[PDB]
């Protein structure tokens, strides 16, 4: 019942002050009970009860914070202290809210020294500083926060990032991470397993452990008594005969023939030596515990003498283990430097794996074990010394990495605050993030850093300018020297960053679009035929542009007419023309057309002024639409062409003309022209389009292209090279010709123009082929004879004209003494006549 406890605290506020005074000296379990009681006290208004912590001018509150949210090495106690502080913040007076959060932010300078324990503190700080009757609370938050706190945040972030970057082992860690099972940074500068000595008697078992162990329970005769002591001892003889040195932990009563007994200790017992007695009437004793360096508080000077001897011995052991760690570090450094120079594996990474994961791990663990033993003995030593006479920053790679990772989410939180945002961008947070954080750290850290950078860049000018400047410079360099390094690895993170920043719908989409266009054109200019550039730079640029061009799926005459007017060209736009200029021009044109003397004159003036601006400002489609390197780029521009043509009929017709102009280039592309031909077939699906091309003389173009291709194949007949895909382009040309012939008037024009000579000659040549006779070639020959009989069946005038063509062919080929061709045409004439 929280409420009754709350009234009891209200009427007995002196009790909670006593608990707060004592909790600094309680042991961990009573600490937990005390903090639980405090949390339930602040579950009713506790306005008057909060002022207990402000005693001694807030010294008690600061001691609570320091001892609890930072110093104590237990996640649960830190989380519970965070909850207690949150309850204090919720139930506190306004002045107490300021005082408590001031106690909180005063530990910023000491935060880096505490390792991973700062997580709960920082989550509490983020929850408290978050802006949510609450106007006054935000006023307290604003009053308490000062620029000094943000300055220290930035300074410690910069110092830790500098430590990580300037670390001698940064390159070793980066190389080893991608090769071996990387799970640490070791280059930074049962009863049987616990026992070391054991003695037995008629009914007692005296055990000396390898060290101090804090045992919470023991699981394994009528009465069973357990004894323990944590006095370091050289041998079990001195403890065998001195019973006064044994402390009775628990007494357990066993039933008859009880094979299992679980003995749990309400308070864990720390003991280096334990003694188990079967008081009254194969044993396996298994203990759940941790290694402990909290040794018994020594009481005399002999104990400090033994402690100093232990200091010397463990220091020598640690020196030996550090020496072996270095001696194994040397070959590890040797093998790492040889990476990049040439069991189905590279044996170098095998040696690296053995060295790093097995022996270096063991050596580092032994060094660390000696280290922790040394802190234990030294801590108890100075404890006794202080009783008698009455956190420094580290270079740990992992600790710095985890602090940086958490500070990225901190910056992501602080970025929504405007004042802090301006202060941080002025301090140079964007350049720091771009240079170090987006390239280094785990994936979660990289995502948090990119999100924080995006939030910082939101709503602020010249931040986008500097960001695009760095991105453009580095990517453009990678473009210029692409043949000498990994374009994919160098520009993956920055390409992703440009992708995410473009998705932002602030007012500065225009600059990002400008950068995308410049990158796309530069990549086309320098590395259009290069595979990596096309796959990793050109393709993302095309994807971003396509996403920009796609309309998200949910007066007409005026809108159509304004579409006929070209408002902004690319040349004008690259030089500084804005979308605001575009909308202004469109609005003026729409008004002039709606009024369409004055509005007519304005319309004409706008038309010519924009035309003359274009003239004053005064191939990549071919390069990328038939790029033999990648099908993805061809498909992407096919989609772009379809999207453009789907909006305007005249633009569609210009696109058809451009595509038809590219038909001769498909001869060299071969199999690469599949996407272009499919796009063409989709585009000319209308009979009007076919007739439009027929008027333009495209049928004759198809005929001469077929003649050129069959001549090219005939020239390859003398060559022994056999290409399986031979005749694919000729196959598609024949398919397009057959599509054209499906219309009656087109077939009439075909017959009238006497173009039947070309198809007969092609039939002769491909039937005469032997070496270049592939499956596609045979299919093409089939389709030729199909067209032939299809034409012949229609009418007698076509038969007469085909006879005339055969007669002329017989003349020209007999003057060339071509026996087989004459035989073929004679056979054709015989087949038609009979």
């Amino acid at each position: 019942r929280p409420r009754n406890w709350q009234k009891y605290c209200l009427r007995h506020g002196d009790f909670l002050s006593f608990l707060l005074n004592g909790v600094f000296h309680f042991a961990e379990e009573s600490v937990i009970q005390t903090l639980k009681l405090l949390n339930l006290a602040f579950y009713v208004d506790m306005e008057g009860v909060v002022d207990i912590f402000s005693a001694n001018c807030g010294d008690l509150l600061r001691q609570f914070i320091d001892f609890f949210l930072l110093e104590w090495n237990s996640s649960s106690v830190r989380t519970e202290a965070k909850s207690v502080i949150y309850g204090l913040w919720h139930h506190g007076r306004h002045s107490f809210k300021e005082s408590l959060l001031a106690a909180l932010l005063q530990k910023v300078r000491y935060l880096p020294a505490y390792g991973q324990n700062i997580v709960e503190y920082t989550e509490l700080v983020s929850l408290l500083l978050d802006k949510a009757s609450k106007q006054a609370i935000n006023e307290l938050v604003d009053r308490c926060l000062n620029p000094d706190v943000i300055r220290c945040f930035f300074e410690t972030l910069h110092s830790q990032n500098e430590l990580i970057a300037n670390h001698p082992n940064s390159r070793i860690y980066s190389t080893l991470g991608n090769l071996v099972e990387f799970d640490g940074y070791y280059l930074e500068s049962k009863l049987e397993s616990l026992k070391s000595e054991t003695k037995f008697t008629d009914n007692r078992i005296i055990v000396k452990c390898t060290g101090s162990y804090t045992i919470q329970s023991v699981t394994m005769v009528k009465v069973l008594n357990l004894y323990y002591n944590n006095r370091p001892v050289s041998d079990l003889s001195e403890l065998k005969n001195n019973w006064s040195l044994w402390k009775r932990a628990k007494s357990c009563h066993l039933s008859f023939n009880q094979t299992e007994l679980k003995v749990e200790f309400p308070i864990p017992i720390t003991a280096c030596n334990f003694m188990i007695e079967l008081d009254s009437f194969r044993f396996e004793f298994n203990f759940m515990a941790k290694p402990s360096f909290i040794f018994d508080n020594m009481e005399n000077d002999e104990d400090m003498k033994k402690g100093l001897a232990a200091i010397e011995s463990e220091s020598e052991n640690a020196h030996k283990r550090y020496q072996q760690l270095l001696g194994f570090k040397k070959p590890l450094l040797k093998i790492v430097s040889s990476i990049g120079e040439t069991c189905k594996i590279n044996r170098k990474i095998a040696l690296l794996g053995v060295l790093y994961g097995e022996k270096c791990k063991a050596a580092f663990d032994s060094v660390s074990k000696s280290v922790q033993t040394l802190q234990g003995l030294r801590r108890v030593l100075m404890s006794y010394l202080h009783q008698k006479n009455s956190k420094t920053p580290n270079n740990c790679y992992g600790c710095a990495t985890t602090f940086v990772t958490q500070c990225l989410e901190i910056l992501q939180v602080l970025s929504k605050h405007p004042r802090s945002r301006k202060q941080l961008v002025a301090a140079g947070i964007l350049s720091e993030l771009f240079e170090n954080n987006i390239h280094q750290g785990p994936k979660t850290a990289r995502a948090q850093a990119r999100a924080a950078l995006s939030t910082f860049s939101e709503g602020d000018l010249s931040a986008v300018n500097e960001l695009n400047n760095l991105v453009q410079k580095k990517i453009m360099y990678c473009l210029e020297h692409h043949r000498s390094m990994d374009i994919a690895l160098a520009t993956r993170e920055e390409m992703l960053l440009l992708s995410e920043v473009c998705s932002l719908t602030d007012e500065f989409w225009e600059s990002r679009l400008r950068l995308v266009f410049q990158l796309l054109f530069s990549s086309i200019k320098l590395g259009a035929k290069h595979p990596a550039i096309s796959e990793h730079i050109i393709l993302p640029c095309l994807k971003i542009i396509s996403v920009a061009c796609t309309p998200p799926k949910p007066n007409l005459n005026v809108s159509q007419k304004t579409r006929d007017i070209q408002l902004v060209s690319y040349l004008e736009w690259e030089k500084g023309a804005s979308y605001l200029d575009f909308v202004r021009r469109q609005y003026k044109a729409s008004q002039s057309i709606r009024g369409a003397r004055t509005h007519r004159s304005d319309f004409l003036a706008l038309k010519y002024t924009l035309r003359w601006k274009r003239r004053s400002s005064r191939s990549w489609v071919t390069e990328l639409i038939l790029s033999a390197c990648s099908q993805s780029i061809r498909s992407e521009m096919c989609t772009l062409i379809s999207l453009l043509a789907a909006q305007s009929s005249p633009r569609r017709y210009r696109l058809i003309n451009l595509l038809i102009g590219l038909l001769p280039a498909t001869l060299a592309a071969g199999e690469s022209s599949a996407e272009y031909f499919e796009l063409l077939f989709k585009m000319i699906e209308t009979q009007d389009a076919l007739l439009f091309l027929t008027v333009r003389g495209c049928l004759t173009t198809i005929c001469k292209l077929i003649s050129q291709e069959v001549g090219n194949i005939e020239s390859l007949e003398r060559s022994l090279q056999i290409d399986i895909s031979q005749g694919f382009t000729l196959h598609k040309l024949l398919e397009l010709l057959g599509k054209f012939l499906e219309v009656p008037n087109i077939r009439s024009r075909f017959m009238r123009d006497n173009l039947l000579s070309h198809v007969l000659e092609a039939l002769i040549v491909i039937r005469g082929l032997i070496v270049q006779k592939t499956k596609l070639i045979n299919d093409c020959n089939r389709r030729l004879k199909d067209l032939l009989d299809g034409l012949l069946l229609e009418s007698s005038e076509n038969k007469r004209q085909f006879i005339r063509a055969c007669v002329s062919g017989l003349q020209t080929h007999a003057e060339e003494n071509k026996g087989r061709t004459c035989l073929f045409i004679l056979e054709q004439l015989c087949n038609l006549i009979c």
């Binding site: 408002l567 040349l571 979308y579 453009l644």
Partner: peptide
Amino acid sequence: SLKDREERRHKSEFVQRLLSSAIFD
């Protein structure tokens, strides 16, 4: 909103005109 949808219409049309100009200029 309808105004936002119309603004996206104008933006998509503007970038489409940019592409057509970059292709046909």
